[model samples]
Target chain A: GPADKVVKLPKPNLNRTGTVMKALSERQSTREYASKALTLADLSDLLWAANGINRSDAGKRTAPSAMNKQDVDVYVILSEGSYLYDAKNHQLNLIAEGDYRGAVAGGQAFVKTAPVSLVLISDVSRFGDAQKIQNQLMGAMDAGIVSQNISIFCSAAKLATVPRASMDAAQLKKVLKLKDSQIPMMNHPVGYFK
Target chain B: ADKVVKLPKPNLNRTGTVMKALSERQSTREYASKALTLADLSDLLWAANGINRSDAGKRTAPSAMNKQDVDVYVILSEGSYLYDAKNHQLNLIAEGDYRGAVAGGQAFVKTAPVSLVLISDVSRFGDAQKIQNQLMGAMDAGIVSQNISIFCSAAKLATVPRASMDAAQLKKVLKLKDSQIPMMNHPVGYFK
Candidate 1:
């Protein structure tokens, strides 16, 4: 069986309707998920909401990063394979060639059940010195900013997701070929309500 | 300054879609001289980190392991106060204007009528001394900060998320604990 080496995501539907206040009111961590996979449209919008480049001219994302370093990188984990979300291109570039949701799930069985899981990795090196505790903290905060975007987007789009800090970081680092500076701060398992 | 100001209920029906809010969200340092109405202030605080889930007491912003470590402090011209989210009221922490303290030498910051500071009590995460715990706390504060930014965007208010502030001065003003760290602040007001 062949898997998509590159998933060119459809343009996000920016016109989608749902008030921010309503979304905040409805936002909650949904652990159980429907087995059905997310439509490409939904995935595209999700990725765009997560950390997509909103201001292309300035290369700024929907989420604000500390010092505009854009430290956080979103990794998409699907049933077929895992890939890194290329925000500039609005596409998914293959990272691994098989289901690695288990690595994202760590010991939590519920996490592997979602159609997609987005892993937020912070390349703290963008902040000058990755070894500095301040830089690491900044990176973590940036990841959290991206994580909240996903959560809020899911709520507004009527999808289900939860931001989880628990994951097999070691295995994910190996699978994603991440460097020491690339820290996986959070992961979100997204799907429809069961 | 009022000893205690009870906030009105948040208006969930406030206009502006989430997508539109995200699209319009940007850091704006210039704020109108006019202060925000009590209604806007009420909704802003609730949206920032209010308890959306009453049964479980969960917040609009999620914290690491539900520790709910992040606390939003309200800084106004009259005085510095703490936003008691559970009670949805502003309790006077200190009397007199302290927006200058939040400004931390940034002249533009003091112009805003209100500043919301996010302080993370890392002690809630077990050992506050650990770097990992501090990082988690910072992340939680960031989560709450976004809520403030997006809410302002939706409400057509002006705000900017800032990490710079006089931490030492704020500590004394807010009477912060050793484990409590002010991670971010948002100077919010009407557009100029």
Candidate 2:
């Protein structure tokens, strides 16, 4: 959640443990969450794991985009408001100034109280003249990678997180001012499991 | 990468840290013309969509509402086969190198040692449709793909997932039924 102003996140911990197996075995969905807000450092690292820029040399990210289209825009909904995670800059771009975490998950109670929920929006326009099925598949799968990254990170950090496809697109459209080409694919509510 | 060769139980004792795997995980398009070992196939398939929980019927990957509607078809240069996760057996579906069909048109996929075709049965969504179904199915396939990517990274193999596959053509080639919709094609092998 925002504090009535835009908050720039600190850099991700590139030196964090890259323990692949432990996270893999521990990765699973958790619905319950604590109200404690994640620190800006945690937010930065989570966003990076979700899909922030990983390789500055090639302009690549933590997750791969189909044909490097990078069409998915990551949005975070918190207790205070919502912000779009600008991966390249490692900054949280404020989108709204209200607690819309409740709206992030349409049919869930715990999600509303979670410290933060990562929203993945796929803008199909990035596909250009590509095939319809292919575009949707790529966009969805790319969003999926980010979602898994978040889940795995949560496991590694011993936090609670679960990715859900139960988002209300129509309601989120008004909340995020989405375009026709932009489709909300999934959301992962991350916080301390209580 | 041929016939219905029974794979050994996956060596779950894979060595590598999660963060290191994540740091190295990325899509690779170029693959060497080398066949994967039975162990490699076993581990990769298990990672892709194996059943990790026997009591609950849960999997290595999460499914929306736990529908478990995703089916992973293993496509090799020798033949095409379905990965039956429960039995841990490869059920041959077709013969010949139809890996070309897995990739929409990319030449590399045809030559890659192995490619996995993710097919989602939307009918399992019950009352869900359109956006809900799409979101669920795609996310399901995506997690499965991530599992593969991480495993490949840990094992020092290279993989490149393609969404550019000719789903219609590959469906016909694999003889997939109407209920199964091909979603993504992930080619795996040693990096060139």
Candidate 3:
């Protein structure tokens, strides 16, 4: 059995910023790595830019949400344990014990290989008994937005990442200790790649 | 010194007329809607964040996670309030004028016939932890917010969506219950 180590990852530095449209113009998804580990600040800023509150006043975000309901959640998986991104506080909340990056996103050679993996999720139970469609995609779409944000930020920061929709939602959810509502949306196996 | 609560003066039009305005839309900061009509308000709201899909099943705005978290709140001259886009209903939340609380620099939020604010019930997602989930939510919010800005432009209504206000203050004023996270703000009305 693996022990849960209390290590708070760094928030990536969004010191480099740009608009989504602008980021889109020059967007390219890269899947490569550098041996250097991202600082806690780097991880934080990346998550913040991915879905963090950009304007506390409007509760608007660096990226957009479906209805501002933002039912989607980001599970941060590292070598140690899984954590939920606390967008409100701009920090990571620990979710489980031990590393499962290799196991959760095994398809993406980089995922098993990278030091960090961000798992995007969608939960239709969020719609309650509604069985809504647009609401269901919230998880997938939010993952897309954050995926793009990471790509753009990577361009700005010179980091490497890949957003892979090819994943086993149920299997990944099990690895992250998530319930049925928490559907695995996507996975971005990230690391330093030129 | 200038009054502490003084609102910002609206910006000048780089272009004029309805289509011209639409062509130059970029979330214009300046606004003045001293004499906007109710028709203009209806059109802009419909064009902006209004649901043309006409069913709980369909929404004009693209919502990530598709929770449809955004609900509109309009500020009339009589009081500050909210609008139910789905049901086409209006509910008042505050009395007197408080457009000054909208944006720090947009004077139009103060003068517009109706100031529209959008808040989403976030707890609806129930502790989502997927980056994809978060991304979809954000993308949808962006789409709707932009739709509103464009609607104002085409309607020739002076309008803007600002996040420059004090969120905690606005949330308190709106009496938002638990799990309701206000995501966007827009002030809409006719130009004098």
Candidate 4:
């Protein structure tokens, strides 16, 4: 059952991208998605900003982590397979092959029918559950920083996206077969509005 | 310190220097010596998280804890100020040229076309310290500063984040008498 919900995403372009700063100013959250589907290029770029590596050798990403303990994993739910986006290689590793966007998005009118939805999960235990392991606020800070990057990058690319923090994290953890270390922090859906 | 730190000219054409500029995106220490037009300041503020991403929530710069704790305060020629991003208006905090006070009397501080300050409000997070809340709060400020430096590089504008700020002067000078924590300032303008 869990295997059926994992998702993989299209590869984002490492080459053709904008200033992100310039792209940010022109992006709108309420973009209208037409029948025209979002291309792999758009998907890749979106995922890239979500958790893509900015500085290497240290697995440094667009967002900041407390001690470079990047414990955030992005679960991508697409039409083919529900999978996790591997930012390290900039590819989508298939988890479950099917469109769980609607169900995963929990039947939100628009969410049930978007081209792509990204679930940002934090495996608190991944950094270790020791009371002294990771800064408790690190997840909140790190996740927000990363999620905001996703929104801004999406905006810069002239795409529509919304960051929803009011979703069921527990259920998402189950659906994604997430270990105790992984916790779904927020849900970000990107698409051309209809 | 001098009232207006004049610039010493050198090379200003930093066109194809993206990575260098970004890697060079440290807290700027001095000015390149020039004056910025309204256009440079406009682009600078916008890049420095001027609601470019839209909404009271979304922004070009990522907020620490996504709390949007950092507010962009603009200090102009006449007085010190704060930019209410959502409202798209500049709230005058102090009336009277307070540039010198805002930038800590740095040579470039007095010369830039616009000085953008990032302030934090601890109360905004509500008991954040118990959970290491300031980390998230300050990271937001860091992201904004990074964006400013990047945008400055792209627009050929000069930006430096001042960490060595005089805490008391900053709080009072910006009229940050209410809910604002003084952080860093990005002085924006064309260097001479």
Candidate 5:
């Protein structure tokens, strides 16, 4: 294992400073990546930036979900295994063992070496089974906000990243042990740019 | 008028940092029955999916594989138009206030002067039925939606992103083609 089966990420630093314009200006999809893996601290901050707990008092997140249905769960895929990002606990819960970066995106060659792949999955069950199409639409949009957060964070930290909707969902569901109700929405491969 | 409406150049010199904007990045349903300036509409459109790279028709927001299939449409009191990012102008598609058709029963839609509608041409993906096509189309539109959100926040304006738009009605109102599917709506204006 890279570190351990369950990696508890450090408490995210809310004090990180950067200008929105600077981030937006630098925000672009970079396919090339450095082989070096991210430090635990950097990884934590990146996850936080992706969609961490922004407002503790209100229990809100960095991204807004439809009606506060935070149904999208962030699955972290590293060399060690696939883990679910427990935003409430600020830790990565190991759900699958072994590197499955290839499964994150079926044909994308960059996932093989990108260092970190944040796979967003949505469980439509959270919406209680009414208006299925509407729920799916909202879920995709909510996932989009989370994906953009990663792109903006990559820009702020001077890293490389690309959010992808291309993936083998049938295979990914089996690999991640995702239920029929939960569909893998998208993937964002992040690392230092080459 | 079918002629292109030239918009005032967006003011790039805005104050506020990234963290502050993200913290304030929220959806507001409350709106004032006020009109936005040409500059405000210009800035909002540019932020939505404007061409950041003149050399290459790349946008402020990205699409999967850079297909750039999402087309941003603007609905205003004057009429509805398609944004020509490369030229920074609005190409009139339909004229007359169709704001009521945008939000359905949401009163804010009638009150807010500017609403950005995202429509995707799925056929551009080469495989119209591909799951990737569907997901990518929605995500691309969504990213552009977020760009509007942050830009609105930075400008100290109010905006709310809604995924519950009547796509069929909106498509007809906007006079879009069969390939164009309306995905989302964002009403932007001053909130009181």
Candidate 6:
């Protein structure tokens, strides 16, 4: 039943608190998290800051990609189900029903405790040749760019998150219905401070 | 030979919020010929992967597995120097202008007063030859590169993250080991 639902996220709050320097000064890896779920406003702003369209005129995102291919895609995994973030429309399209945070956490127990986990998958096929090492490197770098945005935004907004590379890749590929070219580069488990 | 240049303390009170910076971030190709003030240069390098937590020697940019593989190299009209994050200063690598090596055929890149080259020593990962290790290094470099971009935007400076550079020439100029690979560069300057 949850797979049929689409969550239309509210517009991102451009006026959120914290200066860029302050955020960088406070930026650090936060593993501990409270069990409380993030509010709708926080969720909306978090995703937007991660990789939303900053320039509406050209559909440019907050994170820059090599050749402007925009290969990295952000997927949200919540308690109810997993969904793909549609940045252009500012909405979440359900991909699967039921919780799959375990798949995202892999063997790390602390990761499963977070209320929300954002997984970054790079569809290397967009680079024309999926098998090329250069393309794969570009994909990973682009994913890293988006991951930094998440870390910086979380720090700025006083949320908690850590960029992680360890995850159950095989299970995630099946759960998210990813193609062979889609590689999971990094993930961030986000929540309020413990 | 150029001696080690001590930098001024970073003015953390710079204006602009993180949200505003991200909204306004964009690549700029044109720049003023005027050189950057030492204060601006100090803050720029500090923001571009300088040490933030002195207690543990952590940096503004997080590295893969905390390996701290990426090192920032400063290329100026006078010479190229390596940014020593711990001391918050620059150690001259070679004397003489080498901005052309970073420009890599792009004339616009040389116009900027200063350029920062991000080199990741994949050897820190223990397996420099593996493709996965190199990819992680690139990711780390990208993380630092984004820091530079965001800081430039917030500080009202201009910059563009560029991947193209004369790696062989840079390695020779910087005296880099085989394990150190140039991954990305950024040309920074004031707006025209």
Best by TM-score: 6
For residues B5-108, could you state the per-residue lDDT of candidate 5 as single tens digits? Answer: 89887666656555566777778887877788888888788878887677777877888778888898988888889999888999998889888878877876
lDDT of 4 by residue, B95-117 (tens): 67767766574566777757787
lDDT per residue (tens digit) for residues A16-103 in model 5? 6665556676678888889999988889988877777777888778777788888889999898889988888778888888889888
- DockQ of all candidate complexes: 0.78, 0.48, 0.05, 0.17, 0.44, 0.78
lDDT of 2 by residue, A1-194 (tens): 44345677887776676455556656778898888888877888888777877678888877777778888889999877888888877888788878888778797887887889889998878987334765776788888877877877887778899888887779888987778788888898989878
Q: Is candidate 1 or candidate 2 better by TM-score?
A: 1
**Which ten contiguous residues of candidate 3 chain B have the minimum total lDDT?**
B1-10
Which structure is stronger by DockQ: 3 or 6?
A: 6
Residue A126, candidate 3: how far off, in angstroms? 2.6
Tens digits of lDDT, candidate 6, B74-181: 999999999999999999999999999999999999999999999999999998899889989988988888888888888888898889999999999999999999
Give me the runs in candidate 6 sitting further than 4 Å from their true place. A1-3
Model 4: number of backbone collisions: 29
Per-residue accuracy of model 3 over A40-101 as CA lDDT, tens digit each: 76776677656666556666665545455566678888887788887776667677778787
Better by lDDT, candidate 4 or 1: 1
Clashing pairs in 2: A18-B19, A18-B20, A19-B17, A19-B18, A19-B19, A20-B17, A20-B18
TM-score versus the correct structure, for each prediction: 0.97, 0.89, 0.49, 0.62, 0.89, 0.98
Query: What shift in Å separates residue B34 of candidate 2 from its native position after superposition?
Result: 2.4
User: What is candidate 6's lDDT per residue for A53-127, written digit by digit as tens?
Assistant: 999999998888888898999999999999999998999999988899999899999999999999999999999
Stretches > 4 Å off in candidate 5: A1-17, A130-134, A168-171, B127-132
Question: 4 or 6, which is superior by DockQ?
Answer: 6
lDDT tens digits, residues A1-194, model 4? 23333335554454454554445455445524554567877777677667677656656665545456776778887766678877777777776656667655664666666677788777666566724423434454456556666665665566677666556566666666777666565677777756
Error of 6 at A101 (Å): 1.0
Q: Cα lDDT for residue A81, model 5?
A: 87
